[PDB]
Amino acid sequence: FMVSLPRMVYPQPKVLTPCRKDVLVVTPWLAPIVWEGTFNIDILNEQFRLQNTTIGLTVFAIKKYVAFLKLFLETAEKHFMVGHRVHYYVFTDQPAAVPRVTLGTGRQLSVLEVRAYKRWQDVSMRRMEMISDFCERRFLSEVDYLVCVDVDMEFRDHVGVEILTPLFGTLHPGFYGSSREAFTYERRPQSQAYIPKDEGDFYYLGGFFGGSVQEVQRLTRACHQAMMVDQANGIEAVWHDESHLNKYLLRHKPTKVLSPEYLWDQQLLGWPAVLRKLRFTAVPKNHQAVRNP
Numbered sequence: 673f674m675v676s677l678p679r680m681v682y683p684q685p686k687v688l689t690p691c692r693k694d695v696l697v698v699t700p701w702l703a704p705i706v707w708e709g710t711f712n713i714d715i716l717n718e719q720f721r722l723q724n725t726t727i728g729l730t731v732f733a734i735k736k737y738v739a740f741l742k743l744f745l746e747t748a749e750k751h752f753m754v755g756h757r758v759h760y761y762v763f764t765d766q767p768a769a770v771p772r773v774t775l776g777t778g779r780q781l782s783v784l785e786v787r788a789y790k791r792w793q794d795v796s797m798r799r800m801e802m803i804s805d806f807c808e809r810r811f812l813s814e815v816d817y818l819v820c821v822d823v824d825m826e827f828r829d830h831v832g833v834e835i836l837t838p839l840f841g842t843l844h845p846g847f848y849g850s851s852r853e854a855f856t857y858e859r860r861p862q863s864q865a866y867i868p869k870d871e872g873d874f875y876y877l878g879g880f881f882g883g884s885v886q887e888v889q890r891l892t893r894a895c896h897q898a899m900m901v902d903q904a905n906g907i908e909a910v911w912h913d914e915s916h917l918n919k920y921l922l923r924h925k926p927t928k929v930l931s932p933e934y935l936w937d938q939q940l941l942g943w944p945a946v947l948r949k950l951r952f953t954a955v956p957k958n959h960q961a962v963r964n965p
């Protein structure tokens with residue numbers, strides 16, 4: 673049950689004036705595409721605070737990637753869901769390496785110890801199993817929504833309740849202007865992740881997705897099961913869990929899509945005029961050095 677909103681004074685939405693004319697702000701299945709200028713965060717904050725919403729944020733910091741946690745968490749404190757209840761879940765093979773970050777009121781952090789796999793591919797792919805294992809009791813009792821992100825990142829601007837919905841993905845910043853045949857979906861029919869050249873709405877990122885706990889448990893269980901079928905068939909998808917996530921979101925359309933505001937790489941892609949804000953961005957790193965002992 674939802675109580676009434678209070679009286680609020682804010683600018684009138686004008687029907688014959690779009691918020692953004694330069695971008696698609698709604699998918700063909702009527703899911704909002706979240707860009708700056710499309711939402712009044714005061715109305716959304718009211719709606720979600722009246723529900724006492726709790727948001728879980730999952731982040732994996734395995735092996736050398738524990739070095740990214742200090743900046744990730746300190747910037748999360750400045751920018752992620754401030755004013756709302758937040759539960760961080762840090763999955764790591766090194767609990768003693770998790771930095772002591774000071775948190776705002778109504779925010780908590782739990783450290784979940786997990787095993788480390790040797791190959792970066794497996795570390796990244798096995799997040800789906802691990803998230804689904806933890807949905808299956810812990811998340812269901814503790815949070816309303818789960819946001820599942822890469823750790824090699826920092827928040828630079830607001831990331832708030834505008835993203836929350838039963839199921840969301842995020843447009844990969846390398847592909848948002850690309851035609852679908854250029855998307856790097858898995859193209860081998862022998863893989864569970866296979867998408868034909870004439871299918872596909874968007875190219876979503878493996879590094880930022882989420883939803884209600886029920887929908888995120890569905891997605892992560894389905895992706896884990898599909899990866900297991902591929903492993904048994906001796907095939908590993910071209911972009912690993914990202915490829916499986918794209919297949920899942922093609923067949924189970926998300927109820928919001930985040931614009932590339934929400935996962936950008938300024939070093940590789942700069943700051944185009946269509947991005948009014950860069951909210952969550954890649955930390956530069958050396959793949960070969962950071963992924964291997």
Ligand SMILES: O=c1ccn([C@@H]2O[C@H](COP(=O)(O)OP(=O)(O)O)[C@@H](O)[C@H]2O)c(=O)[nH]1
Binds near residue numbers: 731792879962963
């Ligand atoms: O040795 C590793 C490799 C990967 N990851 C986790 O897997 C995510 C995806 O890997 P990565 O960020 O290397 O992929 P990229 O964004 O560089 O393509 C990382 O953010 C970490 O959460 C990890 O913790 N340790």
Ligand SMILES: OC[C@H]1O[C@@H](O)[C@H](O)[C@@H](O)[C@H]1O
Binds near residue numbers: 844846856911914
């Ligand atoms: O083509 C898909 C790939 O795009 C690259 O830019 C990115 O580094 C990869 O992680 C993967 O998403």
Ligand SMILES: OC[C@H]1O[C@@H](O)[C@H](O)[C@@H](O)[C@H]1O
Binds near residue numbers: 879
């Ligand atoms: O190579 C697979 C990786 O691709 C990246 O683009 C994505 O942000 C990571 O989360 C992981 O899915």
Ligand SMILES: [Mn+2]
Binds near residue numbers: 822823879
């Ligand atoms: Mn990453």
